Amino acid sequence: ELASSTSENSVETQEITTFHDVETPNRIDTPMAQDTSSARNMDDTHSIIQFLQRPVLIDNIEIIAGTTADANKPLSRYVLDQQNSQKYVRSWTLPSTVLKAGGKAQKLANFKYLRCDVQVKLVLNANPFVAGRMYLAYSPYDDKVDTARSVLQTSRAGVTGYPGVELDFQLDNSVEMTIPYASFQEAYDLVTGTEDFVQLYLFPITPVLGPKSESESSKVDISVYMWLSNISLVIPTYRMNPD
Amino acid sequence: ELASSTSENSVETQEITTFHDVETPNRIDTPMAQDTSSARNMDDTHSIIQFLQRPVLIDNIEIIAGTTADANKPLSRYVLDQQNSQKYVRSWTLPSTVLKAGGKAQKLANFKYLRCDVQVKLVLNANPFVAGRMYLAYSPYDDKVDTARSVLQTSRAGVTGYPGVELDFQLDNSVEMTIPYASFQEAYDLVTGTEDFVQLYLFPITPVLGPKSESESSKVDISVYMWLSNISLVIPTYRMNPD
Amino acid sequence: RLEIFFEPGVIPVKPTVNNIGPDQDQLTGAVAPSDNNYKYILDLTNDTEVTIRVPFVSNKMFLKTAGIYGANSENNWNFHESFSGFLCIRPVTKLMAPDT
Amino acid sequence: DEMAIGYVCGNPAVKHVLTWKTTDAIQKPIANGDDWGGVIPVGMPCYSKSIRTIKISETENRETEVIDAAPCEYVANMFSYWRATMCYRITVVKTAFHTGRLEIFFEPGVIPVKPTVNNIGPDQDQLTGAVAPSDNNYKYILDLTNDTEVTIRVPFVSNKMFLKTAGIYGANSENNWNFHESFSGFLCIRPVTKLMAPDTVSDNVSIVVWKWAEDVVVVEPKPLTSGPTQVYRPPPTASAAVEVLNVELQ
Amino acid sequence: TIRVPFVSNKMFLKTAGIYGANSENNWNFHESFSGFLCIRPVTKLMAPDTVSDNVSIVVWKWAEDVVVVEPKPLTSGPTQVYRPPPTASAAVEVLNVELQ
Amino acid sequence: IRTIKISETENRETEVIDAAPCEYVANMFSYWRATMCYRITVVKTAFHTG
Amino acid sequence: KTNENVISFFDSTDAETQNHDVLMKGCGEFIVNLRTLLRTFRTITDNWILQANTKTPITDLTNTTDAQGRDYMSYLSYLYRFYRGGRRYKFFNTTPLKQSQTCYIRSFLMPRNYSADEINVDGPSHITYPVINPVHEVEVPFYSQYRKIPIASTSDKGYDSSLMYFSNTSTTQIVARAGNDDFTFGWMIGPPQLQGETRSVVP
Amino acid sequence: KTNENVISFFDSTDAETQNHDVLMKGCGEFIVNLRTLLRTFRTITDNWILQ
């Protein structure tokens, strides 16, 4: 309850290095509430920078038994020319892809380097009469190397050779996957750096087979969630990449 | 080096509650690099949500011996009418003030409640011939109560009674201060909630006394840094306050 | 695969001259991303039920019991200060069902 | 170790994606395009191949063999002879509403084929339940209602210490000997019971088959092909010409 | 004395520096530092008329825990020490990279 | 940059780098790695404040 | 639905035992690791024509043979994404020498993907005289700014080491390469398509 | 007047340890003494004409 104030004097030099920065003056004259109390409610979780590892709908694909567009296009057994590339249902350019959703980018603002593995999970949901198969898989620098070395420029036997996971509409409701940090660059430039790394894919092993009439249609749909693990954010900066 | 892929089957039900959310399918079919390695450089600090406690220049005041504007106006011994309120060198409406600088707002994005104490520090830097004094101090809901109960509507003896700290241009190079969470509302609405709380002040105990000629002038200047402590961020949300 | 996420704070509504309803327009996956919101995804093929328990959280010791009583365009303040949040049930994957 | 032969060859890869219609008859290896299938060469080297024919003039065309080799078949191309246990995981993509019983039997020796002026295909006519009884042949009958997959491991058996790795390379009417001396047998997939499927679902079922080897042992550090190892590079246009490497020295 | 540990999301950094750096060639310059120290006054300099209105700021440079890699300059030209000519008009010797 | 005259139709530019002892050594190799140290001194009098 | 099993035909017998028995009667050696092929030298070009006094970075030749897939280094590179370690080269002179000349071979360092005109001719160097030593063997240490390097990425230049060639007279030799005892690939991927015989025909 | 101090940014870590780790992945050798360069031969002239 007294001495509701402070006064002069102090010591020589000072640090009080609160995180970054220091400052050096003659110690300091400062009040604080005489032994302050919580006085409020902080017992409902706390969370941390682990924010980036929160699963987020990073796109939603809708497969339709109606074989029309190249969305049903099944993996080609051969690839004689580039005009007949391999057709995928959807592709994502990680890691920038996951860094734009869930508002994770605005989170790691003012940071320079980052290192982690992209975690993915495809949650399927087709009905009992829809049969079909799909092979997930990922490639490193697929869009950063000689075209011939692309997963899109190879036979079905080659595409199926890439690190991936199978998916059957009538067996597994969801499949996950991990993309180890595949950065030859220690870290990753959050500001500058094109952050460009490899595109991830999702090829249809077989054509979505559905019952033949028209007027009813048979759908499958999917939900793609992504998050990061083994995260590493270290050097701050005033710059951030708005690309 | 083999089994560069996965296949069918799994278990009944599932959780894999990564932070928030759950999902429930039949276990999961998923690859991972056979026992993955760091392969990169993460030994240069790590930092955490402690980001908010990083000191940030939250304004810079420049005191000039030239007694002209109400910046030199010394604390009035009396306050007979509201037209002759008390004049301060500068005032800040915390905590929103500190939440807009250093890009801390964009940091705690998608969060609902917050609780903490505002930490302040005034670093002075006047020359050897500049004499003067100043009393920092803070008030709770000063701009949220009957005017008569305002620190600006009271005598010099009353203003000096408020919780604060002194500052002499020739003794202390810097003074700090702590603003205990003064929230009657458990927490604080980051989205909605006007977040409006009390204004902080800085009154000049005495007029900045400097040597009398013209053409040279005598300055003081100051640097106001602020950060938070005893932080508490808990319930996420898709909403954020752009006010 | 139905999704159920909780969102603390005010509830997007469209007050009426004599009532109060939800503003579905302000709760779509685009304007209302539930990526950071506590949720659960019930898959109809695996589970058929789920009991969600929501502890008390309202940056307030207690909440008013006014509810929707006498709530309308001019009087809708007691309504907000009496819930603390809302549970949203949005389908993650479109419902599948044969003509059979 | 990402370069140990054993693991490289252990990398699974799909070779066929046959279509089994409720129409198809039993005791008849699923015929169908794709390439082979009902008759898998069961050799380590590659067997399937497509011919890319381009125009050079109205008086000639340029044929270039394109082989879609799997990870194990890709390695077997660096050596002359091989030896290992071939493993194949047959998957029948379908629904719990489809019912059937597919048969998979192995037959050692030459493979009934019909050589082409520039390729080699199976002689399905010579592999029917009548002319090709699989009563004494090692087999397995996968029932679609109970199981959905089955991994068949075929140990090395060829009355020969090692087998050639020529495969289908440059195989045609006049040159089809190296093809035979490079497999040792073939797996046949003939439906035991006609595929059943209500009109509420699809009258078809995709059959995915993976390939890889184990207990592998290669011999001479040189390809057995008549030409230097060369990776086919898909040209910009279906008309652009490809580079052909020779065996001439200066 | 401020010590700045090595941090460049790269095992090593180029030693090109400012050598032959200009509008068209400034890439090797960036890939050879990893950062920069900025010296900005927090509080305006105070100084009575009895002294000088200026203050010299001397900055020293040196490294510790050093580790170099390839025994060859990264420059496009052979290592050469500049030798101040007799007159400001005299020409200097330029070494090439041609071999006989 | 030391620019000299060769004729009224051209000049000769030669780069002059004032490298320090550490910068002088770093010029013999291709890549480097180390902890850079810098001692900032403010020559002044006890009358200057900043 | 689900399940899945496994079956092995015939009567087993250590497939390893049998194999080892066969290699003891029809081979003599047992190749197990593919990295060993990154140690064995193989020709990439049976003739590499070059002019006199011309600093030619092997990359001009490398970029071509790396995509062909003729040697092991190139063929095996199509199964991985990264590489790491030094490389070794051997140049077997096939150029006719004139007594009126004194042909010598010089190879220097340089950064990867650098133009001979933007680098110096100093640093480590090797030299041989085809008149007494037709083979010019040399190794390029792994001087990189990264622990690993993916094949052909971005505009990452001068990140590691390259090899520069030189000769006082116009030369022509057979080049063979192989990685050092530290070279290796990483991050296995899917294999591309192989090529077969080409002969052309009428219809 | 006088005083003087010292400060190291970031979180330390044996700069030596890190270095050695890097030279084990991007070098293979560790140059420490410059006198060693007085042992290695280097060309001073690519052609020295004499009668």
Domain boundaries, chain A: 1-243
Closest CB to D205: pick one of A80, A131, A157.
Answer: A131
With b for 16 or more beta-carbon neighbours within 10 A and e for fewer, the D196-227 pattern comes to ebeeebbbbbbbbbbbbbbbbbbbbeebbbeb
Residues in chain B within 8 Å Cβ distance of E5: 44
Question: Residues C39, C51: contact at Cβ < 8 Å?
Answer: no
- Sort out which chain G residues have CB atoms less than 8 A from H28's CB and list them: 86, 141-142, 182
- All chains having 3 or more CB pairs closer than 8 angstroms to chain B: A, C, D, E, F, G, H
All chains having 3 or more CB pairs closer than 8 angstroms to chain A: B, C, D, E, G, H
Per residue, the 3-state secondary structure of chain C, as one string, reads CEEEEEEECCCCEEECCCCEEECHHHCCCCCCCCCCCCEEEECCCCCCCCCCCCCCCCCCCCCCCCCCCCCCCCCCHHHHCCCCEEEEEEECCCCCCCCC
| Shortest Cα distance, chain A CAs vs residue E76, angstroms | 25
Whether E55 and chain F come into contact, CB under 8 Å, resolves to yes
The H or E element containing residue A176 is: strand A174-179
Q: Identify the experimental approach.
A: X-ray
Helices (H), chain A: 96-100, 156-159
- Please list the helix, strand and coil fractions of chain G in percent, rounded to the nearest 5, in that order: 20, 30, 50
d(CA B201, CA D6): 75
Length of chain E in terms of residues written: 100
* Of residues G9, G22, G198, nearest to D162 (C-beta): G22
Chain E residues closer than 8 Å to H50 by CB: none
Give the integer Cα–Cα distance in Å for A50 and B18. 10
**Of residues B22, B110, B192, nearest to C41 (C-beta):** B22
Distance CA G87, CA G59 (A): 12
Q: Which of E84, B47, D2 is nearest to G189 (CA)?
A: D2
Q: Which residue from C40, C46, C50 is facing B25, i.e. has the nearest CB?
A: C46
Question: Following CA atoms G64, G65, G69, G74 in sequence, which dihedral angle do they give, to the nearest 10 degrees?
Answer: -110
Does chain A reach chain E with at least 3 CB pairs under 8 Å?
yes
Cα separation, B89 vs B74, in Å, equals 9
Is G153 close to A140, i.e. CB distance below 8 A? no
- B156 interfacial to chain A (CB closer than 8 Å): no
Q: Report how far residue B73's alpha carbon sits from residue A138's, in angstroms, rounded to the nearest whole number.
A: 69
Burial-class residue D99 by CB neighbours within 10 Å (0-12, 13-18, 19+).
middle
Residue type, G144: S
- Name the residue among B61, B89, B77, B72 with its Cα closest to residue B208: B72
- Residue G71 contacts by C-beta under 8 Å, 6 or more apart in sequence? G42, G43, G44, G65, G176, G177
Q: Do A22 and H7 touch (CB under 8 A)?
A: yes
Q: Which residues of B touch C46 (CB under 8 A)?
A: 12-14, 24-26
For residue A41, the chain C residues in CB contact (below 8 A) are 59
Chain G residues in contact with H25 (beta carbon < 8 A): 84, 144, 147
Cβ neighbours of residue G2 under 8 Å, at least 6 residues apart? A171, B8, B9, D148
Cβ <8 Å between F50 and B128: no
Q: Which of G2, G147, G190 sits opposite B8 (nearest CB)?
A: G2
Distance of residue B178 Cα from the nearest chain C Cα, in angstroms = 23
Identify the residue whose tokens are 């993907």.
G113
Tell me if chain B has a CB within 8 Å of the CB of F35: no
Question: Residue F20: CB partners within 8 Å, gap ≥ 6?
Answer: E61, E62
Rounded to whole angstroms, the Cα distance separating D70 from F37 reads 56
Q: Are A118 and A179 in contact (CB under 8 A)?
A: yes
Question: Which residues does chain F have within 8 Å of residue E69's beta carbon, measured at their own beta carbons?
Answer: 29-33
Sheet containing B174-179: give its strands across. Answer: B56-57, B222-229, B117-124, B174-179
CA separation, residue A38 to residues A42, B187, B235, D16 (Å)? 9, 11, 18, 67
Mutate: best of A185, A233, A239, partner E, most E CBs <10 A: A185
Q: Which chains touch G (3 or more CB pairs under 8 A)?
A: A, B, D, E, F, H
Question: Exposed/middle/buried for B161, CB within 10 Å: 0-12, 13-18, 19+?
Answer: middle
Q: Identify all chain C residues contacting A51, using CB atoms and an 8 Å cutoff.
A: 36
Name the burial class of residue G51, with classes exposed (0-12), middle (13-18) and buried (19+) by CB atoms within 10 angstroms of its CB: exposed
Cβ-defined contact of A127 to C94 (cutoff 8 Å): no
Distance from CA of G72 to the nearest CA of B (A): 19
Phi, psi of A77 (to 5 degrees): -70, -20
Best probe of the D interface among A160, A165, A203, A213, by most D CBs < 10 A, is A160
Looking at the complex, report in whole angstroms how far the Cα of residue F38 sits from the nearest Cα belonging to chain G.
24
Retrieve residue B197's tokens: 């709380």
Q: State the number of CA atoms in the 13 A half-sphere of B19 facing the CB.
A: 22
Q: C-alpha A120: how far from its chain's center?
A: 7
Q: Does A119 touch chain D (CB under 8 A)?
A: no
Assess C28–A contact: CB distance below 8 Å, yes or no: no
Do residue G152 and residue A158 have CB atoms under 8 angstroms apart? Answer: no
Tokens of H48: 């020295």
How many CB atoms within 10 Å of residue B59? 13
Contacts 24+ apart (CB under 8 A), D30-35: D30/D189, D30/D190, D30/D191, D30/D207, D31/D124, D34/A77, D35/A77
- The beta-carbon contacts of E51-54 under 8 Å, at least 24 apart in sequence, are E51/F45, E51/F47, E51/F48
Tokens of G108: 């220097």
Neighboring chain B residues of E13 at a CB cutoff of 8 Å: none
For chain A, the straight-line distance linking the first and the last C-alpha, in angstroms and rounded, comes to: 54
Q: What is the C-alpha separation between E48 and E41, in angstroms, rounded?
A: 18
Contacts of H10 in chain A (CB under 8 A): 234-235
**CB-based contact A88:B89 (threshold 8 Å):** no
d(CA H28, CA E40): 42
The answer to whether residue A168 neighbours chain B at the CB level (below 8 Å) is yes
- When divided into structural domains, chain D yields a total of 1
User: Which sign, positive or negative, has the C-alpha torsion E18, E22, E26, E28?
Assistant: negative
Which residues in chain B are contacts of G190 at CB distance < 8 A?
Answer: 4
Token pair of A55 as six digits: 């699963």
Bridge partners (DSSP) listed for residue E57: F42
A207 in D contact zone (CB under 8 Å): yes
What is the distance, to the nearest Å, from the Cα of residue G64 to the centroid of all Cα atoms in its chain?
11
Are G193 and D66 in contact, with CB atoms under 8 Å apart?
Answer: yes
Give A226's strand partners.
Answer: A56, A120
Does residue B57 contact residue A130 with C-beta atoms inside 8 Å? no
CA–CA min distance G158, chain B (Å): 20
CA angle A98, B25, C3 (to 5 degrees): 65
Give H31→chain E minimum CA distance, Å.
Answer: 7
Half-sphere exposure of B2 (CA within 13 A, CB side): 15
